[PDB]
């Protein structure tokens, strides 16, 4: 397994956080692609947010590719989403916009958790109701409450 991180209008510190943590978590080689701007094609001026599905569909469909953006994103019927993944597919996107915080260590943990979550989906995992990174999070407060680790059931499936 290899993971390709596509920076899209996100600071380089956030990228380095994922580059350094993902490899051990997934026993995969991680590659950072040249940064680029998130495409204005995906911008929704009315909402001042980018559409997560539109961003996802512009990434190369190469398992596993994770786009990471600093911009706030939404999906159809959602105020906002933290991200979006192709379940059992190739691509996912993560926005760190809703995750920002002046507590640098907390921010690091949130970024890693939600990246791990999205990649879990790419690897075929659905939402989990155990104490598990694959738990759905309604808000960042919920992100803070779930662990960065897969429960024994989810770990056995990947
Ligand atoms: Zn999810
Ligand atoms: Zn689980």
Residue numbers in the entry: 1 to 158
From the paper:
Archaemetzincins are metalloproteases occurring in archaea and some mammalia. They are distinct from all the other metzincins by their extended active site consensus sequence HEXXHXXGXXHCX4CXMX17CXXC featuring four conserved cysteine residues. The overall structure of AfAmzA resembles those of other metzincins, consisting of an upper N-terminal domain (NTD) and a lower helical C-terminal domain (CTD) with respect to the active site helix α2, which harbors two of the three zinc-binding histidines (H117EIGH121) and the catalytic base Glu118. On the other hand, as the homologous archaemetzincins from Methanopyrus kandleri (MkAmzA) and Methanocorpusculum labreanum (MlAmzA), AfAmzA exhibits a second zinc-binding site located in the CTD immediately below the catalytic zinc binding site and close to the eponymous, structurally important Met-turn.
Consequently, two different crystal forms are observed, one triclinic and one hexagonal. In the nat-AfAmzA::citrate complex the catalytic zinc ion is penta-coordinated in a either slightly distorted square pyramidal or a bidentate tetrahedral geometry by three histidine imidazoles as well as by the carbonyl oxygen (Oβ1) and hydroxyl oxygen (OHβ) of citrate, with ligand-metal distances of 2.0–2.2 Å. The catalytic water molecule is completely excluded from the zinc environment. In the case of citrate as zinc ligand, the S1′-wall forming segment has to move to avoid steric clashes with the pro-S -CH2-COO- branch of the ligand. This has also been observed in a citrate-bound crystal form of the related M. kandleri archaemetzincin. Besides acting as zinc ligands, these carboxylic acids also mediate a new crystal contact consisting of a salt bridge between one of their carboxylate groups and Arg152 of a symmetry-related molecule. As a consequence, significant differences are observed between NHis-AfAmzA and the two carboxylate-coordinated nat-AfAmzA crystal forms. On the other hand, we detect upon ligand binding opening of the active site at the S' sites.
